[PDB]
Write a protein that binds this DNA or RNA. Structure first.
Ligand SMILES: Nc1ncnc2c1ncn2[C@@H]1O[C@H](COP(=O)(O)OP(=O)(O)NP(=O)(O)O)[C@@H](O)[C@H]1O
Ligand SMILES: Nc1ncnc2c1ncn2[C@@H]1O[C@H](COP(=O)(O)OP(=O)(O)NP(=O)(O)O)[C@@H](O)[C@H]1O
Ligand SMILES: [Mg+2]
Ligand SMILES: [Mg+2]
Ligand SMILES: [Zn+2]
Ligand SMILES: [Zn+2]
Lengths: 665, 434, 669, 97, 52
DNA sequence: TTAGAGAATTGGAGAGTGTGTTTTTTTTTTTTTTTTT
DNA sequence: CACACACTCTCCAATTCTCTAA
């Protein structure tokens, strides 16, 4: 076995030196028999990695640098040899080795996944081979500043030059090859760390997550460098002409690319809604206000000064707490008395896909430079105004046929692409008036509404949450679109009529399960529910009956659990929550449904000086809500003293007492 | 492995019992003659071991530390056969080696020699006190109180980690009452002055001898050693360990007598040469011309150096008064007159002597100096040139260039024959009769 | 049909690195095979500028000497197959590990079974093209080859260190695998193959092999250390065949691998993740000669080649070789042929003698340059420091009784006594040069009396009682009383010295700086021309500078200085002339006359040690002719030197009578 | 030479290597201390042999020396060679007076 | 050529508005950019930190 | 749809194993160098 | 030695997950 490994490394290293070299007369020279060495290396990739599921050849071709020292220089020189000739306007031989260099680039750059069906050897090498793919991305983007991306578009031009009808399938294959090359160079992304858990944790945790090779920075791999190298090598102009020329073979690679470099850009950075120094200053004043609150909680003398408090309590008995801060502040004393408890209740906490808006943190933002941010926004604005409408119309047909074949990755990269573009283009048409909304008019067409709704329904029914989460996101965006076009002005009525019985029950069940899943899932359910209720309210089947379908304890639970994360929420998401609590309190007079203790602690923890910022717009309506809540709580308690235990526990379902508890006769 | 040791042992019993030259069984006779006077050792000359069966010398010189202690048991088995009646005890005999293998210069010892029998020579600069090594530990368990013993042979073993028959991880204590021990001594050997390379300080080895080889030397003697060049794991670099010699045979070059209460170590074949020489009618002419034969004239200085080499006679009165028997001589004179060439000669003829320069000297370096031992942190006394030269001659060249504070330290040691000390809480009068 | 793991590359292919580091490239098996064949072909096929196979001549000498070490010159790699010179500088710890095997196979082609004599050869790389002081080293040097200069300041004993080690597991096998041991850190293994868990071990005693080990603390050279700022040091490690190569206090130049390792004491006391650094030495050179010189390659500047020994034999039979060699002593100092003669004799020396083992005679020739100011007494001594094999220089109030001689040190740690050797030990088989000898303290000056005649240093201090050897020739320079020679007085009144030290010197030169209108033209002309010729602004450059250095030197000297340095060391180490005994009447009448005329009160102390001097000087002249036998012409030249130096020490009132009386001996040559 | 191993302590003529050592009160300097500069004035190096520390040191220094006559007044009746306690060995080292 | 590493950049601020003495040092300023005036008594060897 | 019985995984009690700890350090003699004696 | 700390191993029961009938 190990002899086989070292013989494999020796055979591939001897092939790697056979390709060519700098010549030293430096201008890289092709080795004699280079085409046969390239074809043999493709054979090695196939006849080992397909045939035996090993990854060993794909590992050891990185050890001997074949990509960064041979394939890249060969493609970049051939690009110069064709650019010069085009500016002058055996090259038929050099075409074949340029193609085979692109073939090996696509094989080496192909996305890695691990699964139940994965080999014991593949799961061994996975975390390592992600580092070599990171080096390949850095080298492709920076080696002569993306001249290889220019060579890739040239090999596509070679088949764009011959007609949509008069082309051959062996050339439509080359189009798919070039699109798959770009999606790969985009979607090289730093790996997961992984630990074996058969053996328990030592007295420190995982002391570094840092899955990067020795000479790669996190910035060399970022969308900033991707956007930079794409604009400098005219890649965007290629993608834009390509997505307009659609008047089937390539639609799904093209959507894949638009997903892979729209995925982690939260759109709001593209719209601002000395400036960076003013922005830095405001943030330093917020950190100063936080440190002022920490200083108001800190010792006015040294750590050893030693003052000791005794608290008399009912049953005429004592506790004791240390520290000068506790002597004067009764609330700090009781907070310290709870902080010291050495018990904690054990918490309970929660696949082959890329990191995306499903998985990345609510606070995450990617920091475009100012030229990069304008080069990106101008590219996507041209793409929306040209090709989004026809591209969505094409892939929604291809996947309305063929639904059952969509393994979860296709299903996400369709649903998220649909949602992100419709959200961006709604927001552009909010601020810009020359943006048409109706440029994305395809999104509300009956065939696409049916696909999105079917797909979410099947994912919910099959309990595939990653797809239900992506469904909930896209459905929330389609609802935003419907509401906007209704406000602007019959297709609205057709879709709005189309969910009357069953999707209603589904979308009501979604938040009831939400409390079992990630913050991003709960966030999506809340944004969806806010949008639904705002739509159904505006249209009036019966608003009172459908909202009473939502006014149930499990929904209130997921709302409280989303609000527990508030220190990392934004004012928009807190305003959505408290609008729903205002709706429950005033519009329903349900108020007993919210009196449970978890809310009372959570209001105190966020209304505190240590909680929300005092200058925040968010605190103002929390303070207002709390005043109404405490008034109705005082009234209920004065009228029915048993509510002090009823507030401590979940509600009852024994009929007469359960009604009396809920409403006070 | 003990089938293999039994054949090695059987092959050396047969060396003792069969080895003969002429009519005489020289190793059977030497064993018996040593048993009667009660030294339990045998001296073996390695030309005889090669002459009997060269395969045995091959075995011995390939791995000495594993074969020497098999020849010691083969000697004890013969020692019982030739001196006790069977079916009607002796300790483990020492093996001592003589050799004419080529002397290795002390500085040429290196990794090629580790574990080999090595013959060399040097000047003994130091001898330790005697120390006790075990040869038999009696043993008892702390917990279950089982009892046994460990025979020890001192080449390159420790207390067992298991009770031998829970009884525990380190079960054994030593019963000192029933254990048996042997003497061990450390020497330090400097290399010979005429063999030091240009501009280097003379190099030094520590080495160990045991049983009948202890006390066989004194500081300043020139010796040849046969021994096993070997290594020990001192706590005093990395993967590094200290070289020493396990001495197998000291051989003092001139019969300089070592630690010696005037005992009759001479032999009749030289004593009868001396007793004829005494009676030569020209003896004082013969001894005068034998002093520094390459120095012309100076006849009276040669006549006085002969008197100094004999001395007079020491006397001890019923008073308790002690009379000096040693003669002191001063060569005071003009430049280039052979004063220093006569001092460099008396250093070589005298059986004990030290040459020194008064300009290269101190009071403490001449008489005795108080050192501080780095382990105990106690002070201890070390002998200078007058203590090293004791019973002999100290040659003090450049006596006019000695400091006035250093010359005065010699005043007691020239008349009352002692070195008095009162320093660091040590006080003694050391004997020094030179 | 070739084994895929065996197949090889070309010299074209080595440059195309295709690995993440040189460490990873050099270790790949096809690359390693290609490197080996290239290094083999360098040793087999490279030839000198003259056309001889220089590495054949080195391999002859390697196997004949039974030497374990092969000298290779880095320039010979930079001049041929230069990628190997590059890899050797970048990662020597892998490159030398191959070039040691190639050197073993290169010598085994010549001496089959040399494996039975040594299992391994080491390559002592020499003349590495760039040099650092210990202050100039930086992290960018780590794992690279360096060349470095310093003073070896401590030099521990020589110990057997473990090289190959198996281990016993306590649980199971007496056979854990044979680790080659790295000379820097412990074995640290954390595993057992015979039991796949943590457990205790003992170092196995079935097999092991040892190598010699010695640390040397190497410090910056005080003439490169900027004044008032501290000298830096590094630990240096010498392994098998490099141990015992350098003595405490030499200026040494090391080539070696700069390395570093973790140790907790640094990280503890310094409070940062900082690593100790060590130079594993790969060769050593001793910085003797003039050092501002490109023409003097190799680890030993006083070694000769066979084509150099043959050149010594040729010139040694030049008619008048003695007077050519004498004219070449300090060739840029005009006149003073009696001092140049005395310096030549002291610089070659006589023959030391031992008689039946009982008695011994001094072979070194001691010289006193006594005279007026500004007369090249100090320049003659500074020339002999460049020219002699082992030499030490000392001056007046700067030299103590036991900085000459030897002293006893007390260690701060083990804190018991040891010897440190002085200038007369560090110049043993060599010369000690004592400038301003009259201005030493008499307490310091009188330390020399044993080392002049008995050629030993007999210490008895702090319970250390012993004798060191000290066979130096001593050359001393002094001025007379009042700072000027006064020719009407006897010598014993011109000088503050006394008969026991004046008689230990066995040539005396008196220098009088008298005014003369034509000798001061000849002297001033020579000094003016010597400034113009020595001016710092008066076929490739490293060779082309040597034709101008050769041009300028040969205007002044009958013999090249590089040849004369090697000729002197050769004559000192190989040649030991005997006497024919036809001298008896001459030498006896010379001694009788010299003694009879020394009845004068303040006259030079002629003594039996000044008969014995004529015999030493006659042996030194036979060494200059590179003869094993003293001739009657050497006995005449020696009698002329000793009689002229006696007569020149007399007062003008009797110098005429003495020149007239001794004429048969002064005019004998 | 300084201890407690021995080492070099740099003096006034080394601290001024490649520059000027200015010496005042020069005639009032003890002659036993004056002679120590005869190597450093001409051979431009200081060389040493003491305890365990033999050495050779640079002293490439120009000397500027200020002096008083023996008696204060320059005795104009005398050539410079008689006004001043210096002897020919050091009188010949200074380039000009 | 081999691969050549990431470069590490020493950002060297200078010309601060104010200078502190060794006696002005107080733990309240930990982690903040000062300038300090003083006289050197000793300097260590140049040693390698293990940085990454 | 609630609520209650049976199955699987995690927390931490507690048993077991292994390692380090005393600790000092001035004093008194001997030497070799500077300078202030 | 023996007694605290550092650290790993193992078992047991406590809590939460999942399925069934009331
Ligand atoms: N009478 C002599 N017979 C033979 N050799 C002699 C004689 N006198 C002197 N010599 C030799 O000349 C040298 C004398 O030096 P040395 O013996 O050291 O003189 P010394 O008397 O000790 N003089 P000094 O140290 O100056 O007071 C030695 O090499 C002697 O062998
Ligand atoms: N004969 C000479 N030929 C050439 N240069 C000379 C000669 N005599 C002296 N010099 C030069 O003049 C200087 C004086 O020589 P130097 O060796 O310093 O004098 P010195 O004899 O030792 N006098 P001193 O130090 O006062 O006892 C040096 O630079 C010499 O190079
Ligand atoms: Mg003498
Ligand atoms: Mg001079
Ligand atoms: Zn027991
Ligand atoms: Zn084991």
């Amino acid at each position: 076995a190990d002899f086989s490994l070292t013989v494999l490394r020796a055979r591939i290293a001897l092939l790697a030196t056979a390709i060519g070299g700098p010549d030293y007369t430096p201008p890289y020279k092709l080795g004699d028999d280079c085409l046969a060495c390239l074809k043999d290396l493709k054979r090695w990739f196939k006849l080992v990695d397909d045939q035996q599921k090993r990854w060993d050849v794909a590992m050891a071709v990185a050890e001997y640098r074949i990509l960064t020292d041979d394939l890249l220089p060969i493609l970049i020189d051939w690009e110069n040899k064709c650019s010069l000739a085009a500016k002058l306007a055996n090259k038929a031989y050099y075409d074949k080795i340029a193609l085979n260099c692109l073939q090996l680039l696509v094989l080496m750059t192909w996305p890695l996944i691990v699964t139940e069906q994965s080999s014991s050897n593949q799961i061994t090498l996975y975390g390592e081979l992600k580092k070599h793919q990171l080096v390949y991305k850095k080298t492709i983007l920076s080696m002569e500043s993306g001249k290889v991306l220019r060579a890739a578009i040239r090999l596509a031009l070679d088949v764009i030059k011959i007609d949509r009808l008069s082309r051959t399938p062996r050339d439509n294959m080359v189009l798919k090859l070039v699109l798959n090359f770009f999606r790969n160079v985009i979607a090289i992304e730093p790996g997961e760390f992984t630990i074996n858990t058969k053996k328990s944790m030592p007295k420190k945790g995982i002391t570094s997550i840092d899955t990067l090779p020795p000479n790669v920075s996190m910035d060399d791999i970022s969308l900033n460098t991707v956007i930079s190298s794409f604009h400098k090598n005219k890649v965007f102009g290629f993608l834009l002409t390509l997505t307009s020329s659609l008047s089937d073979f390539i639609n799904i690679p093209l959507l894949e690319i638009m997903f892979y470099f729209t995925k982690d850009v939260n759109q709001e950075l593209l719209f601002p809604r000395t400036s960076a120094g003013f922005e830095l200053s405001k943030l330093l004043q917020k950190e100063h206000q936080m440190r002022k609150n920490v200083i108001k909680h800190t010792s006015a003398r040294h750590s050893r000064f030693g003052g000791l408090l005794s608290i008399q309590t009912p049953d005429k008995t004592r506790l004791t707490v240390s520290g000068s801060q506790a002597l004067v502040d009764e609330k700090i004393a009781l907070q310290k008395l709870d902080d010291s408890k050495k018990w904690n209740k054990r918490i309970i906490k929660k696949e082959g896909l890329p990191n995306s808006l499903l998985n990345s943190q609510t606070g995450k933002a990617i920091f475009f430079t100012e030229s990069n941010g304008k080069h990106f926004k101008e590219f996507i604005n041209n793409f929306i105004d040209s090709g989004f409408n026809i591209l969505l119309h094409s892939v929604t047909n291809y996947f309305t046929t063929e639904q059952d074949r969509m393994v979860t990755l296709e299903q996400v990269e369709y649903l998220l692409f649909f949602a992100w573009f419709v959200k961006y283009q709604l927001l552009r048409s909010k601020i810009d008036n020359s943006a048409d909304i109706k440029q994305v008019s395809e999104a509300l067409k009956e065939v696409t509404f049916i696909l999105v709704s079917s797909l979410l329904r099947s994912a919910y029914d099959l309990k595939n949450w990653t797809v239900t989460h992506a469904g909930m996101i896209a459905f929330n965006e389609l609802l935003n679109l419907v509401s906007r076009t209704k406000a602007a002005q019959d297709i609205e009525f057709i879709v709005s009529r189309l969910f009357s019985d069953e999707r209603i029950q589904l979308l009501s069940n979604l938040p009831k399960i939400g409390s079992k899943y990630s913050l991003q899932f709960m966030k999506s359910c809340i944004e969806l529910t806010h949008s639904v209720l705002k739509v159904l309210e505006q249209y009036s089947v019966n608003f009172q009956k459908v909202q009473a379908n939502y006014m149930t304890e499990p929904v209130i639970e997921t709302y409280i659990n989303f609000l527990e994360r508030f220190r990392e929420l934004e004012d928009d998401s807190i305003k959505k929550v408290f609008s729903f609590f205002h709706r429950v309190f005033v519009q329903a007079k349900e108020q007993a449904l919210l009196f449970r203790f978890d809310l009372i602690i959570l209001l105190r923890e966020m209304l505190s000086p240590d909680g929300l910022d005092r200058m925040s717009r968010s605190r103002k309506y929390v303070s207002q809500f709390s005043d109404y809540f405490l008034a109705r709580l005082k009234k209920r308690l004065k009228k029915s003293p048993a509510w002090f235990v009823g507030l401590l526990f979940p509600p009852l379902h024994n009929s007469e007492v359960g009604f009396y508890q809920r409403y006070g006769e | 492995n003990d089938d293999d040791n039994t054949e090695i042992i059987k092959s050396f019993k047969n060396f003792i019992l069969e080895f003969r030259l002429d009519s005489q069984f020289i190793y059977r006779d030497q064993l018996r003659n040593n048993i009667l006077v009660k030294n339990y050792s045998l001296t073996v000359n390695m030309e005889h071991l090669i002459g009997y069966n060269e395969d045995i010398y091959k075995k011995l010189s390939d791995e000495p530390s594993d074969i020497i202690p098999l020849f010691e048991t083969a000697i004890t088995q013969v020692a019982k056969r030739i001196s006790i009646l069977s079916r009607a005890s002796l300790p483990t005999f020492q093996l001592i080696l003589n050799s004419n293998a080529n002397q290795i210069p002390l500085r040429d010892l290196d990794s090629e020699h580790v574990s080999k029998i090595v013959r060399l020579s040097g000047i003994i600069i130091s001898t330790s006190v005697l120390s006790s090594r075990a040869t038999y530990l009696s043993i008892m368990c702390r917990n279950c109180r089982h009892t046994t013993s460990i025979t020890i042979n001192n080449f390159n073993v420790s207390l067992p980690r298991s009770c031998l028959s829970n009884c525990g991880p380190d079960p054994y204590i030593i019963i000192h009452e029933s254990s048996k021990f042997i003497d061990q001594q450390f020497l330090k050997l400097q290399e010979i002055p005429e063999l030091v390379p240009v501009g280097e300080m003379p190099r030094n080895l520590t080495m160990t001898c045991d049983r009948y080889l202890t006390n066989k030397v004194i500081p300043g003697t020139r010796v040849t050693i046969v021994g096993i060049y070997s290594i020990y794991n001192s706590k005093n670099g990395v993967a590094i360990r200290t070289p020493y010699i396990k001495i197998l045979g000291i051989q003092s070059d001139v019969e300089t007598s070592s630690i010696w209460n005037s005992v009759t170590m001479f032999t009749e074949e030289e004593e009868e040469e001396f007793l004829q020489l005494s009676r030569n009618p020209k003896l004082y002419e013969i001894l005068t011309n034998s002093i520094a034969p390459s120095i012309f004239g100076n006849e009276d200085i040669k006549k006085a150096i002969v008197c100094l080499l004999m001395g007079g006679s020491k006397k001890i009165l019923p008073d308790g008064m002690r009379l000096r028997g040693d003669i002191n001589v001063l060569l005071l004179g003009d430049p280039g007159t052979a004063k220093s060439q006569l001092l460099k000669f008396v250093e070589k003829v005298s059986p004990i002597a030290v040459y020194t320069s008064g300009k290269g000297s101190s009071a403490a370096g001449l008489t005795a100096s108080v050192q501080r031992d780095p382990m105990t942190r106690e002070f201890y006394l070390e002998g200078g040139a007058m203590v090293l030269a004791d019973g002999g001659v100290v040659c003090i060249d450049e006596f006019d260039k000695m400091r006035d504070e250093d010359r005065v330290a010699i005043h007691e040691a020239m008349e009352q024959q002692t070195i008095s000390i009162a320093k660091a809480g040590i006080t003694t009068v050391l004997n020094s009769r030179t | 049909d070739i084994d895929p793991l065996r197949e090889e590359l070309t010299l074209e292919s080595l440059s195309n690195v295709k690995a993440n580091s040189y460490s990873e490239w050099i270790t790949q098996p096809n690359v390693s095979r290609t490197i080996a064949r290239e290094l083999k072909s360098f040793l087999l096929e490279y030839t000198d500028e003259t056309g001889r196979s220089v590495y054949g001549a080195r391999i002859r000498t390697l196997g004949e000497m039974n030497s374990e070490s092969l000298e290779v010159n880095y320039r010979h790699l930079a001049e041929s197959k230069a990628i190997l010179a590059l890899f050797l500088a970048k990662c020597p710890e892998e490159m030398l590990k191959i070039f040691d095997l190639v050197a073993m196979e290169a010598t085994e082609l010549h001496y089959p079974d040399y494996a039975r004599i040594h299992s391994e050869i080491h390559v002592r790389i020499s003349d590495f093209p760039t040099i650092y002081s210990l202050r100039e080293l930086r992290e960018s040097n780590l794992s690279s080859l360096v060349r470095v200069t310093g003073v070896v300041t401590r030099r521990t004993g020589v110990f057997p260190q473990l090289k190959y080690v198996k281990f016993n597991c306590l649980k199971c096998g007496s056979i854990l695998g044979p680790f080659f041991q790295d000379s820097n850190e412990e074995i640290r293994i954390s595993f057992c193959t015979n039991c796949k868990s943590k457990g205790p071990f003992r170092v196995n005693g079935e097999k092991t092999v040892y190598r010699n080990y010695q640390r040397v603390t190497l410090q910056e050279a005080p003439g490169t250390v900027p004044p008032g700022r501290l000298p830096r040091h590094r630990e240096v490690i010498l392994l098998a065949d490099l141990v015992d190569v350098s003595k405490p206090g030499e200026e040494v130049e090391v080539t070696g691998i700069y390395k570093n390792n973790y140790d907790g004491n640094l990280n503890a006391k310094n409070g940062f993740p900082v690593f100790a650094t060590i130079i594993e030495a790969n060769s050593i050179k001793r910085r003797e000669g003039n050092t501002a010189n490109e023409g003097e390659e190799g680890l030993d500047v006083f070694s000769w080649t066979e084509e150099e020994e043959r050149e010594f034999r040729k010139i040694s039979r030049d008619r008048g070789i003695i007077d050519k060699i004498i004219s070449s002593m300090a060739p840029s100092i005009y006149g003073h042929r009696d001092i140049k003669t005395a310096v030549a004799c002291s610089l070659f020396g006589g023959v030391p003698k031992n008689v039946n083992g009982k008695h011994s005679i001094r072979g070194d020739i001691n010289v006193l340059l006594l005279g007026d100011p500004g007369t090249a007494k100090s320049q003659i001594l500074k020339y002999v420091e460049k020219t002699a094999h082992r030499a030490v220089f000392a001056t007046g109030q700067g030299a103590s009784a036991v900085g000459l001689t030897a002293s006893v040190r007390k260690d701060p740690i083990t804190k018991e006594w040891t010897l440190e050797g002085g200038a007369l030990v560090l110049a043993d088989k060599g010369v000690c040069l004592i400038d301003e000898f009259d201005k030493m303290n008499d307490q310091d000056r009188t330390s020399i009396h044993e080392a002049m005649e008995q050629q030993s240093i007999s210490i008895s201090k702090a319970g250390i009682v012993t004798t060191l050897q000290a066979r130096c020739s001593i050359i001393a320079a002094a001025n007379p009383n009042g700072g000027r020679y006064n020719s009407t007085l006897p010598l014993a009144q011109n000088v503050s010295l006394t008969e026991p030290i004046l008689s230990r010197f066995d040539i005396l030169c008196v220098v009088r700086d008298l005014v003369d209108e034509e000798a001061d033209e000849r002297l001033a002309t020579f000094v003016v021309d010597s400034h113009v010729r020595s001016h710092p602004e008066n076929l490739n450059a490293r060779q082309r500078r040597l034709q101008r250095q050769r041009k300028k030197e040969e205007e002044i000297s009958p013999i090249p200085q590089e040849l004369l340095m090697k000729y002197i060391h050769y004559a000192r180490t190989k040649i030991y002339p005997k006497l024919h005994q036809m001298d008896m009447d001459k030498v006896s009448r010379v001694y009788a006359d010299l003694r009879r005329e020394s009845i004068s009160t303040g006259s030079f102390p002629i003594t039996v040690r000044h008969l014995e001097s004529i015999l030493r000087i006659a042996e030194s002249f036979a060494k200059m002719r590179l003869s094993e036998f003293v001739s009657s012409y050497d006995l005449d030249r020696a009698i002329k030197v000793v009689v002229d130096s006696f007569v020149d020490a007399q007062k003008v009132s009797v110098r005429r009578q003495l020149r007239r009386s001794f004429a048969i001996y002064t005019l004998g040559h | 030479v300084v201890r407690d191993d021995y080492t070099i302590e740099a003096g006034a003529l080394m601290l001024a290597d490649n520059g000027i050592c200015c010496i005042d009160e020069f005639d009032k300097m003890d002659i036993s201390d004056q002679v120590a500069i005869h190597e450093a004035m001409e051979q431009q190096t200081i060389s040493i042999a003491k305890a365990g520390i033999h050495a050779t040191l640079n002293a490439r220094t120009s000397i500027l020396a200020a002096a008083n006559p023996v008696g204060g007044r320059y005795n104009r009746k005398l050539s410079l060679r008689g006004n001043l306690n210096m002897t020919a060995p050091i009188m010949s080292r200074f380039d000009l007076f | 050529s081999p691969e050549q590493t990431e470069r590490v950049f020493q950002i060297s601020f200078f010309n601060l508005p104010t200078v502190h003495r060794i006696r002005d040092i107080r733990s309240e300023k930990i982690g903040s950019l000062l300038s300090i005036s003083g006289t050197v008594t000793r300097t260590s060897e140049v040693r390698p930190e293990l940085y990454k």
